[PDB]
Amino acid sequence: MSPTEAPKVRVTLFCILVGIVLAMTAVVSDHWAVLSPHCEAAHFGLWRICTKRGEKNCSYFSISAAAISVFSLGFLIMGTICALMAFRKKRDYLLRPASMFYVFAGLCLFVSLEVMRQSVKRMIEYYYSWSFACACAAFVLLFLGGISLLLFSLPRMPQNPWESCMDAE
C-alpha cells in the first residue's frame, strides 16, 4: 500500500500512460522518413509506404519490424494488465512485472526504430520532422518510466547493518 498510492509512483504511472497511448498512435502515423529525389518527397511506414508530389495511395512493399512492433504492443498490454491488477486487493508486488514488461516494450520499440533507421539509411538525405522524434520520445518515456517504477517497487537498499530486504514491511 505504501508504494502504491505514493505520488512518486503516480507520476511514473501517468508518464507510462501517456507514453503507451502516444506509442499506440505512432504506429500508423508515418511522418518520419522523407526523401527528396531531386518534388517527390516520400513517406516510409511500418505498414504502408507512399510518395506524394490527387493520385495518392499508400500500401505495403522487412515484416520483422511489424512482428517486433506487435510484440512490443503485446508487452504493453501485459504490463497494463499487471499494473491494473496491482491496485486492487492490495497486490503491492505486482508492480514489478509491470515495470519489466514496460521496459521490454520500450526496448522492442527501440530495436524496431533502429531497423527502420537502417532501412531509411539504405535508401539523397532523409529528414526527421514529426514521427521519429515521437517514437524516440515514446521509447525514452517507456524505458525511464519502467526503470523508475521498478526502482520504486523494490523496497530500499538496506543502508543499515540490521536492515535487510524481505522484511515485514
Binding site: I63, S64, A67, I68, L107, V111, E114, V115
Partner: peptide, 23 residues
Amino acid sequence: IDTFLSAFFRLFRVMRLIKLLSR
C-alpha cells in the same frame, strides 16, 4: 524470426552469472 526471413539483446544472457553472486 531473423532466420525465418538487435545486437544488444545478446547481452542479457551474459548477465546470467550476475545472479551467481547470490551465494
